Design a protein around this nucleic acid. Structure first.
Lengths: 87, 121, 96, 217, 25, 150, 206, 97, 81, 129
RNA sequence: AGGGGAUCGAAGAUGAUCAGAUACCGUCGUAGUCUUAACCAUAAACUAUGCCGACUAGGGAUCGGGUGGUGUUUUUUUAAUGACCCACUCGGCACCUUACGAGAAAUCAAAGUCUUUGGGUUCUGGGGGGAGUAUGGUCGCAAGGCUGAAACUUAAAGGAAUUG
């Protein structure tokens, strides 16, 4: 996206879906970003520490985003065992 | 047929949600306060507003009805909305599920007080 | 798929499909049958001289309504009578 | 003045959002044209066509006017708005509004070498509504906007310098031609290229962090 | 007309033309 | 599939991945080939030889037990027939239909089946002529086929 | 990471057994298939409450992530969960739409019932299907208390729970209200339960 | 255009079923395309059962019921109130009520 | 759900799916060691036995072919192999 | 019948990425499509793929990382010259910056950027971008 | 060409209706409807969707077959045994919902995997008429079928939906 002499020229870098690696469109009104909080001792979380996922409108239209959030939970440690890789 | 039109439905919505503390269930006195809470041009229309107003206030006193929200029900709802206990339900008072919930503890490195009882096959 | 021979040795079928379906245009058919040379009063020409035979009052097709003062002219280069139009306002005082 | 009604309007009027690039980053849904007005002060408008469509009634034909409006700065933003209103002034003044609400960015990229500022599109892109399939083709520099007299005005306000258009279908339908090129403008970001392959930290939305003052009650 | 009875007048015309042609030939 | 039919069936047999002999087998490659020979002296089709192997004995396949197939063994031992069993039964099927036709002339469906069987024979005979299993310039003469297939 | 205080103790498992949350619908859709243990001879499919609770942890961890509780939306349409939604609103901000959804509440800014959500939670996508499609225009995450036969289009966090026993939908709102309250604050440690029964959440006749 | 997905009939994988005749005008129609009504009714009329049981020599009667399978063409079924011209979204319904 | 492990599938799904559409294609059939009271020899009989079997020593019936796997006799013991 | 197993390979690959699937099953696993996918693997359009070796030519399972937006074939394998390579790249590929058209060549199966660099030509197998 | 020939029934006879009615309606009624031996080779012969192949989305029935159940039912109440139920599976006629997709739309799970345009292959079409006409060839006992124009004429014909 940059030109010959560095100095990156763009409008904005587009976001990508966490489930299918598809670029979030500007008009993608069905595409949503989910923030989930980070927890600490004695069942209390802290504000400002959030794990950010982006889900495309295509994946939500297919009805498959629930297990997509399950898979994005398993690959970093949001949920321990909710999505089976083998099925 | 003596059904009531949209103008006397809508204005009887408006002055009930705005003047319910100033409102009284008796028809002969809510008719006279309709003059001082609104500028109704004609006396017969004012009778139509006040008759539906005392009809709806008769319906409000037998439990609240949706579509009407005056000032008093807002703070009554806020009195319901400030319901907090000192402590709530799920606690460490005693996972009572199958071996998958043991894999919740075992696979990614946790230490949870399991009481594993499998489901019937 | 898509209804045509795609394979690498199928240039014969592509030739014969194109050369047989090219007989459904108007310009290719007029070029190959030579209809301008055979069935046309102009024998491959843009102009042809002729002689006035009669003046014919032709009523136009509706919604127009006009007598257009047409002229019937025998053409010289083959001998076919044609019906001809005279431009602008009349000119039947200018041709006899 | 103008009072906001949406939380995006509250953030724009308060100055928390400095540019529309954050809006297009998080795909924030615009509901007020004063958001685009006060955050793009240099936005120019153009009326492409006024098509009078009519409805057969018992009285005869009652006729409304359909206005297609192209807006956009040449810095890479363009919008299309179609409104059917009873009068030509109202159709223009409301077609401008929907064109403000439908402002989308365009991906200006490079044909060959990545020289200086971008001139053309970074990829070829398909847009199709109806039969009208407009194919935008990247062009070298100095090629010009090789387009229809309506699509060229759409691409001039989109800010691209040289581009080729291959428009098929019944492209005499002007509103379908402009909408198909509008779709082909929008899918330029949606096409994925290997220079964007790096994973990003996925920045938080301004609506999530500015919750302490927006829509204050 | 249908495409049936345009065809029927065609076929009766063709039958009449065939009989006339065989009469001349 | 289904060369002369509208069916889409996939009913077939998928032998296991093990190309070596199973552990439950007890006979050897020099002990089942005599059973191949004596069953062929009993005048049976190799399609029926493999059935009798798989059923009466534990002999699963000739390839998985021995180093050669059933018809490969018969050609090596000298009990190869004049024509292959695929062409034999197709001609036998055709003769059965042809015997049916002179007693049922108006059996037009069975008449149509004859062209289906005749086309299956002649494609298969064209294949055997290309790989020189049948002799060249061999014709299904359509009259004296019963000399070949009894 | 997860602290050790998130045990599914048998006291709340007894609550799930009393609420009949584990047994559900007669058929399972393909996006709810991993949430089913096995089948039963009488034909009633079962839902494992451990994965139900872990999805409820995730849903609570998204609700408590937003700093404002007033732009979180709870949706009910049928009478089977009106009181549970309102009692969920009775402890957090959590603005409710109980009854008619009146479409044009997430778009159509001139509506009096127009709202400005950052997250929606529905009782079920089958009965609240208009809220799901309207949230697909504003980029709103959807937390859905899905059944097995419930379609799961445009939803993101599916908690599999029963919607036939009366106490099941009330308890799945009650545990979710419990967990968002713990994760926000103003609650003491997890060594003792609520003073009264969860009967305050369930719908009663009349 | 195609008014119905199954064009007016119940015929997939046949090509030809049988012809049947209408019970009103005797029109040769296919059997699946025919509008079929199992006209099940008692022989006697309900305002005459009282007098028939009054005149009955039997203490208990079977009170019988005659049957017919009325096959209708589409012209006759619409004219004789058997079927109605429904809405475009209502054509897809197949329940008898 | 667009993510499956198509290299180690569950054996319940392997028993569910077709014998050809299995990831490693193979038979669902087996062989049986069948013992008759009228003979002392042991005979390996296919599950889909496909042909009536006589014993090597005596004339007896121990299977009856059908469309699928053959029906073993009532007064005959069998063991899987 | 299966007249081109490479075409039936890349069609199911295209159907997987249009669905957005992380994995797909491909039949019946020729070495042409193994070397085709090795060209895709060394450029990063797909993940590490597993070849299940049966005795019936087997099948493979391909991991897709979503970077591949269209993987088409050119059927049949047209005979291409050196000057015709840059004629075909302007038509098959969306931009001159990226995208590969894959040749079969006596030096091996490789993309057009490597074939232009080593100055040899062949028959077009397909294209990726 | 022969046998057969009950009903229905082209033609025809009439009797009504109607301004007319040699059409609808009524009663007859020939060929025909049936068969066998030959012809014809046409149908809105239509799923108006070539055939083969792969993949993509879910569901529930149903046909035929096959697998499994400490499932039910049948003289003996798990002992001599088919049907039914449930879970599947292959092949078929299909159907319902949603369309990511496609299309001009109706609609389509194929009409999808088509401007991000290439799985293989056959046939057909190039505005409407003239016209499936004339001529020629071939097949047929014939009726006719297959192939098949042009002159000339016209700025529309047509498809799907919307309102009146």
């Amino acid at each position: 996206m940059e030109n010959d002499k560095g100095q990156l020229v763009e409008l904005y870098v587009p976001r990508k879906c966490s489930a299918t690696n598809r670029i979030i469109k500007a008009d993608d009104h069905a595409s949503v970003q989910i923030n989930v909080a980070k927890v600490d001792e004695e069942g209390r979380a802290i504000p400002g520490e959030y794990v950010t996922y982006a889900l495309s409108g295509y994946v939500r239209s297919r009805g498959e985003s629930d297990d997509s959030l399950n898979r994005l939970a398993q690959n970093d440690g949001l949920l321990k065992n909710v999505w089976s890789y083998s099925r | 047929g003596r059904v009531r039109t949209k103008t006397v439905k809508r204005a009887s919505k408006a002055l009930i949600e705005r003047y319910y503390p100033k409102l009284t269930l008796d028809f002969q006195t809510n008719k006279r306060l309709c003059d001082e809470i609104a500028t109704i041009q004609s006396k017969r229309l004012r009778n139509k507003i006040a008759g539906y107003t005392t009809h709806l206030m008769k319906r409000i006193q037998k439990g609240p009805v949706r579509g009407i929200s005056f000032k008093l029900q807002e703070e009554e709802r806020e009195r319901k909305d400030q319901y907090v206990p000192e402590v709530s339900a799920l606690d460490l008072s005693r996972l009572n599920v199958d071996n998958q919930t043991s894999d919740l503890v075992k696979s990614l490195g946790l230490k949870l007080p399991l009481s594993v009882i499998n489901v019937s096959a | 798929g898509k209804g045509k021979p795609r394979g690498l040795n199928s240039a014969r079928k592509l030739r014969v499909h194109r050369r047989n379906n090219r007989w459904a245009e108007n310009n290719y058919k007029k070029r190959l049958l030579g209809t301008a040379f055979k069935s046309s009063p102009f024998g491959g020409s843009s102009h042809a001289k002729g002689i006035v035979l009669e003046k014919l009052g032709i009523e136009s097709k509706q919604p127009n309504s006009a007598i257009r003062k047409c002229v019937r002219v025998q053409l010289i280069k083959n001998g076919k009578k044609v019906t001809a139009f005279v431009p602008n306002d009349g000119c039947l005082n200018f041709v006899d | 003045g103008w009072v906001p009604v949406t939380k995006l309007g509250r953030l724009v009027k308060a100055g928390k959002i400095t540019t529309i690039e954050e809006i297009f980053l998080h795909s924030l849904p615009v509901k007020e044209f004063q958001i685009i007005d006060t955050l793009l002060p240099g936005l120019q408008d153009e009326v492409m066509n006024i098509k009078p469509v009519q409805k057969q009634t018992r009285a005869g034909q009652r006729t409304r006017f359909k206005a297609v409006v192209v807006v956009g700065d040449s810095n890479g933003h363009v919008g299309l708005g179609i409104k059917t209103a009873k009068e030509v002034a109202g159709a223009i003044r409301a077609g401008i509004i929907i064109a403000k609400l439908s402002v989308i960015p365009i991906r200006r990229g490079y044909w060959g070498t990545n020289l200086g500022q971008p001139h053309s599109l970074a990829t070829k892109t398909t847009g199709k509504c109806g039969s009208v399939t407009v194919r935008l083709i990247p062009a070298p520099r100095g090629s010009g906007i090789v387009a229809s007299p309506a699509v060229k005005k759409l691409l001039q306000l989109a800010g691209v310098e040289d581009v080729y258009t291959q428009s098929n279908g019944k492209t005499r339908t002007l509103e379908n031609t402009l909408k198909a090129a509008f779709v082909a403008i929008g899918n330029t970001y949606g096409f994925l290229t290997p220079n964007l392959w790096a994973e990003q930290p996925l920045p938080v939305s301004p609506l999530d962090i500015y919750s302490d003052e927006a829509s204050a009650q | 007309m249908r495409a049936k009875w345009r065809k029927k007048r065609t076929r009766r015309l063709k039958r009449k033309r065939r009989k006339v042609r065989a009469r001349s030939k | 599939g289904r060369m002369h039919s509208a069916g889409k069936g996939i009913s077939s047999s998928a032998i296991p991945y093990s190309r070596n002999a199973p552990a439950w087998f007890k006979l050897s490659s020099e002990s089942v080939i005599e059973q191949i020979v004596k069953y062929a002296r009993k005048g049976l089709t190799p399609s029926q030889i493999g059935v009798l192997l798989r059923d009466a004995h534990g002999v699963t396949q000739a390839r998985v037990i021995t180093g050669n197939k059933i018809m490969r063994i018969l050609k090596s031992n000298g009990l190869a027939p004049e024509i292959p069993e695929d062409l034999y039964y197709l001609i036998k099927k055709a003769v059965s239909v042809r015997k049916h036709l002179e007693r049922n002339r108006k059996d037009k469906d069975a008449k149509f089946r004859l062209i289906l069987i005749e086309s299956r024979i002649h494609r298969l005979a064209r294949y055997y002529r290309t790989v020189a299993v049948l002799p060249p310039n061999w014709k299904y003469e359509s009259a004296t086929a019963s000399a070949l297939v009894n | 990471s997860l602290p050790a205080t998130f045990d599914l103790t048998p006291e709340d498992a007894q609550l799930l057994l009393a609420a009949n949350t584990h047994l559900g619908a007669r058929n399972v859709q393909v996006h709810q298939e991993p949430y089913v243990f096995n089948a039963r001879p009488d034909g009633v499919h079962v839902i494992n409450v451990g994965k139900t609770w872990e999805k409820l942890v995730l849903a609570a961890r998204i609700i408590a992530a937003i700093p404002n509780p007033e732009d979180v939306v709870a949706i009910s349409s049928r009478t089977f969960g009106q009181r549970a939604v309102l009692k969920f609103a009775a402890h957090t901000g959590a603005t409710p739409i109980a009854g008619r959804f009146t479409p044009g509440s997430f778009t159509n800014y001139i509506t009096r019932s127009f709202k400005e959500p950052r997250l929606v939670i529905v009782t079920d996508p089958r009965s609240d299907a208009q809220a799901i499609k309207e949230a697909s225009y504003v980029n709103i995450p959807v937390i859905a208390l899905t059944d097995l036969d419930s379609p799961s289009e445009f939803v993101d966090v599916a908690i599999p729970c029963n919607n036939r026993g009366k106490h099941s939908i009330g308890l799945i709102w009650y545990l979710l209200a419990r967990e968002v309250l713990r994760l926000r604050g103003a609650l003491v440690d997890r060594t003792q339960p609520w003073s009264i029964m969860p009967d305050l959440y369930f719908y009663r006749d009349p | 255009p195609k008014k119905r997905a199954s064009n007016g009939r119940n015929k997939k994988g046949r090509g030809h079923v049988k012809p049947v005749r209408c019970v009103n005008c005797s029109k040769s129609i296919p059997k699946d395309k025919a509008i079929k009504r199992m006209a099940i009714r008692n022989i006697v009329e309900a305002a005459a059962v009282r007098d028939l049981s009054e005149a009955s020599v039997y203490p208990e009667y079977a009170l019988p019921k005659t049957y017919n399978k009325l096959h209708y063409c589409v012209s006759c079924a619409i004219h004789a109130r058997i079927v109605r011209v429904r809405s475009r979204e209502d054509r897809k319904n197949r329940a008898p009520p | 759900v667009l993510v499956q492990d198509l290299l180690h599938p569950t054996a319940a799904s392997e028993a569910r799916k077709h014998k050809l559409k299995t990831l490693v294609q193979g038979p669902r059939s087996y062989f049986l060691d069948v013992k008759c009271p009228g003979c002392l020899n042991i005979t390996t009989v296919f599950s889909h036995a496909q042909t009536a079997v006589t014993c090597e020593s005596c004339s007896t019936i121990l299977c009856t072919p059908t469309g699928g796997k053959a029906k073993l006799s009532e007064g005959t013991s069998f063991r899987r192999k | 019948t299966r007249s081109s197993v490479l075409a039936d390979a890349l069609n199911a690959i295209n159907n997987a990425e249009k669905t957005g699937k992380r994995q797909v099953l491909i039949r019946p696993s020729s070495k042409v499509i193994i070397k085709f996918l090795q060209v895709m693997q060394k450029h990063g359009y797909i993940g590490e793929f597993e070849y299940i070796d049966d005795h019936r030519s087997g099948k493979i399972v391909v991991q897709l990382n979503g970077r591949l937006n269209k993987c088409g074939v050119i059927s049949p394998r047209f005979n291409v010259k050196i000057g015709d390579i840059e004629k075909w790249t302007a038509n098959l590929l969306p931009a001159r910056q990226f995208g590969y058209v894959i040749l079969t060549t006596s030096a091996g199966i490789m993309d057009h950027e490597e074939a232009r660099r080593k100055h040899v030509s062949g028959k077009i197998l397909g294209f990726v971008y």
